Amino acid sequence: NISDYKVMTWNLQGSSASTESKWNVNVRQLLSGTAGVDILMVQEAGAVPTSAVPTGRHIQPFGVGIPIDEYTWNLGTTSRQDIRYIYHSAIDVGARRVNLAIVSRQRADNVYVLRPTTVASRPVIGIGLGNDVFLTAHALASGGPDAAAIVRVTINFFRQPQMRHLSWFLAGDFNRSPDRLENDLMTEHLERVVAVLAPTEPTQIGGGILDYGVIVDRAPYSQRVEALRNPQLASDHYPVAFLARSCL
Amino acid sequence: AMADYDTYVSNVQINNLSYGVYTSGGKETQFFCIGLKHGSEAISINAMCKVDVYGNHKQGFDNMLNTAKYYYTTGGDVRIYYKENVWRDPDFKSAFSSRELIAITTCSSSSYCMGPTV
Amino acid sequence: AMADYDTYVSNVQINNLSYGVYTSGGKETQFFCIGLKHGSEAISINAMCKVDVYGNHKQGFDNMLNTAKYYYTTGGDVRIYYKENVWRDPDFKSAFSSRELIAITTCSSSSYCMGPTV
Amino acid sequence: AMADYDTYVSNVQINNLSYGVYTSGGKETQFFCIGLKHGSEAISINAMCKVDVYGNHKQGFDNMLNTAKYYYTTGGDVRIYYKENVWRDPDFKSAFSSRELIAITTCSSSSYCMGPTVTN
Amino acid sequence: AMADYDTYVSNVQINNLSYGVYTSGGKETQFFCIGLKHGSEAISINAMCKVDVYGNHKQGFDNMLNTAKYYYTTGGDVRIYYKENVWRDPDFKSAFSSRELIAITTCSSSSYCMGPTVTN
Amino acid sequence: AMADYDTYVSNVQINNLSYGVYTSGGKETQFFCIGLKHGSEAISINAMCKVDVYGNHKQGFDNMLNTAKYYYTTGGDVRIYYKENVWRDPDFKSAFSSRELIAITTCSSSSYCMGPTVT
Amino acid sequence: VDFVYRVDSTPPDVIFRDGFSLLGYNRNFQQFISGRSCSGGSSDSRYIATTSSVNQTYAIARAYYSRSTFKGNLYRYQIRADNNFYSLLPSITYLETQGGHFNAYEKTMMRLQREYVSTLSILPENIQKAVALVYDSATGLVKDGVSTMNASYLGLSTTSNPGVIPFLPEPQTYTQQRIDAFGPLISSCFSIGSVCHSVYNMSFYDARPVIELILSK
């Protein structure tokens, strides 16, 4: 179930530090240890860590087939390994840099790639672990006008009969207020199918809640997952964690 | 029917315990005593003792001691068979009890404990 | 075949205990008795006893007693060897059993208990 | 008034144990000693012993040992009845205690333990 | 080499236990037998007994019983010293074993158990 | 000071046990031995034993045995009082040690154990 | 093992819809086996305890039914085990090769439980049926009542994982700790409150003194 994992989204676009430093210092911080984040969604990552090692796995994704590269990444030592799996989407078709990545504590059983109808819209990538699918997206910068279409294509893909057993959770940079996304979803008669999970505090330094999550209501114990802003500030975006509430 | 098995209290828990060495009637004794409750309720007949060199049945001191200690640990439901007006030492009676512990059996329901009944 | 090992019940649990002191036939005795169940269901051969100064085998009273206490605590599967029609005290037979407890062995599965079978 | 039961400490727990064999006064002994605390606090009388072949009550060595060990195991609240200035071996007395262990009873509340009490 | 300590099995577990009373050869006896496994696999050397009034060493019946019960309860790795071809009661031998239990020792690791060893 | 209480090791744990029956010097015996460690460290003084019909103090065999089993059960910190060069059976001494076990006391902290010490 | 079991008071129409959910994120293994990360402790365990023993579930239900303050019904849930269900022994062994130490009380508790732990929530797809448990007040026995089969169950060909639990925290420095238990030495993680619900809160004792008694004298 989604609540069994520590999930987090973070957008790398920020300050003077380069992406390599952001991987080796900040992302490591966030994933390290058994209590570290299990599933990390990352946006605007043009490169994986230089420590990462390609696996050569020929990933043929559900949905559409854009090239997804699998990597192993050791967060420990040569003697005491701590292997995390990186799934990176570099480019789409000709050009188009996607720069989406998902870091997982376990090898992905399946990979998913979805495209909204919106013209210049970046794809949605996701990884399946058993009955759970974790997806990330990065809506267009001009107000996230593809944000509802990001959620729509995700809903419709996983409501197919062969996909309905799965719990899915989507998190990323929607570039749109959670309240405004809620109204868009209500307009499209989807507000009762998914729940928007967003922190109460701004997620970019200019203000405004732009990074948050969407979960299918049908996922068992989906109501336990709470959005919580992480205090880190190594880019223009705060990370946002999605953690199960205490039971009681 | 069974002599000294006519008086018992059922579905109690042993919630107190006393073990000591003591001089009584010019003789060096050991004794132990159990305290009883009935769930959250206090009951009037809630103590009974056994002495190694006194009483109607001197045998079984160690086994009854360890058995009392066990049920005090588990907190389980038991039936206590006891005999009244045994101990003559007036200081011991007022400090502990004049009742002699006869037998301890378990209760597998609110209705049933092992052993003979009226 | 081992004498007195022909009658037994297997894969049972000890779900009740009795320990007491008792005068029978002009002797001061200790006894204990075990109550048995078979998983969810009651069984007819469900009580058997050992006496320290009576029976076909008077030895091992303390060891048997502590062994019974052990399996009552864990609730684990045991095989109980016993002998019918031993105790002659009519009050005792009615209150507990006529059966003498002979042996207790462990069952490592629903299929197997240690010890001889017939 | 039960003899040897007028001195005791209440609502303590056994937090230390000693058991040993020892020659004393030309005889082979066993002994054990208990150490006490009072909840999260210490207590000024916190040690007492029993010897198998010496003392005012030589009976009950094994049962008192087993009983002391039990309450060490539980950490539960007890009352300890003891007798002062008993052991006369000066080596033992300064190594362990001069006090003889008489009885151990349980305390079911912070204000009640089983057994007789002195009224003052 | 300690006499009767030349035959043993190491890093085993006691996974079954029998305790009973029994008339054997005209003597009233107590006996217990242990059943052995070796982690996942079963082993041929898997039953060893002690009898209170028979055997090469009749002493220590209660202590050996308590020791066997202990490691059956924890399931810990032990070493079992035993002696082959001891019990001559054919009914007892067929029901359990001919091996007399001699000693039980602990195995603090996969490769070490306490006690004497023999060279091979 | 108390005779046979001058030699001890403090704040150790019992991490092994042996119990057995054994003929020694033409007598039928029981024995048990305790193996020791000091936290994550091995110590050279790591085995000491007690025999029911031999030794400087033959009393307390069952009580010492049951006490030893208890601190093996809990793994708690103890002080072991013992005596050197007691056992004379050469097969027994090389299998375990020459040391007779005298007392076991608890350590309620890393710096305090019950019983007498020497300076 | 193929099938394991839990007892719950939540009725089948709810469990067959939601499954069973983890208390929390606490991966600490010895805190789970001792019940300290379960309902009587920090109540944040990242594991669900199941047993392979049907008889144990009778003992769990009797422990609830025998309380005067307990109202409501109880169900045994039959659960298909898959690669997310682990027995305890390989993790016991592995953690010991990391310098972890389990005392005799904890080892005793662990082998009595016949315990398989789920590292994930348990989906309705794994839950084959529910068996109502009937209490006889006169005998104190618990029997099987009405069984309800779960139409959502998937008869996949899986079995329990024979290996080590992944991501096990490295064992902490050894410490003697309370072991929560109820009934005949049943681990507190088998209590109803030791899975997260959408419930009577059993009380536990320390198993150590009881185990110490049956190991001694």
Numbering used by the authors:
A (entry chain F): 23 to 270
B (entry chain A), C (entry chain D): 22 to 139
D (entry chain B), E (entry chain C): 22 to 141
F (entry chain E): 22 to 140
G (entry chain G): 19 to 216, 224 to 242
What sentences appear in the manuscript?
Typhoid toxin is an A2B5 protein toxin and an important virulence factor for the human-adapted bacterial pathogen Salmonella enterica serovar Typhi, the causative agent of typhoid fever. Typhoid toxin contains two enzymatic subunits, PltA and CdtB, which dock onto a pentameric delivery platform composed of the protein PltB. It was recently reported that the same enzymatic subunits can assemble with a different delivery platform composed of the protein PltC, forming a distinct version of typhoid toxin. Here, we determined atomic-level structures of the pentameric PltC subunit, the fully assembled PltC typhoid toxin, and the PltC pentamers in complex with glycan receptors.
To gain insight into the structural basis for the organization of PltC typhoid toxin, we determined the crystal structure of PltC-PltA-CdtB holotoxin at 2.29 Å resolution. Similar to the PltB typhoid toxin, PltC typhoid toxin also displays a pyramid-shaped architecture with the PltC homopentamer at the bottom and the two A subunits (CdtB-PltA) sitting on top. As in the PltB typhoid toxin, CdtB does not directly interact with the delivery platform and is tethered to the toxin primarily through the disulfide bond it forms with PltA. Interestingly, the PltA and CdtB subunits sit atop the delivery platform in a nearly identical fashion in both typhoid toxins; PltA and CdtB align with an RMSD of 0.292 Å over 383 Cα atoms in the structures of the two typhoid toxins. Despite the fact that PltC and PltB share very little sequence identity, their interactions with PltA are strikingly similar. In line with the global structural similarities of the PltC and PltB toxin, the C-terminal helix of PltA is inserted into the central pore in a manner that is overall similar in both typhoid toxins. Notably, the pore radius of the channel at the center of the PltC pentamer is generally narrower than that of the PltB pore. Close inspection of the side chain interactions between the PltA C-terminal tail and two different B subunit channels shows that all five monomers from the PltC pentamer interact with the PltA C-terminal tail via 9 direct or water-mediated hydrogen bonds. The charge distribution of the PltC and PltB channels is also very different in the upper part of the pore, the main region that interacts with the C-terminal α-helix of PltA; this region is highly positively charged in PltC and is more hydrophobic in PltB. However, a similar experiment wherein purified PltB toxin (CdtB-His6) was mixed with purified PltC-Strep pentamer showed significant displacement of PltB from PltB toxin by PltC at a 10:1 molar ratio. Together, these results show that PltC’s narrower pore and the stronger electrostatic interactions between this pore and the C-terminal helix of PltA enable PltC to outcompete PltB for assembling typhoid toxin.
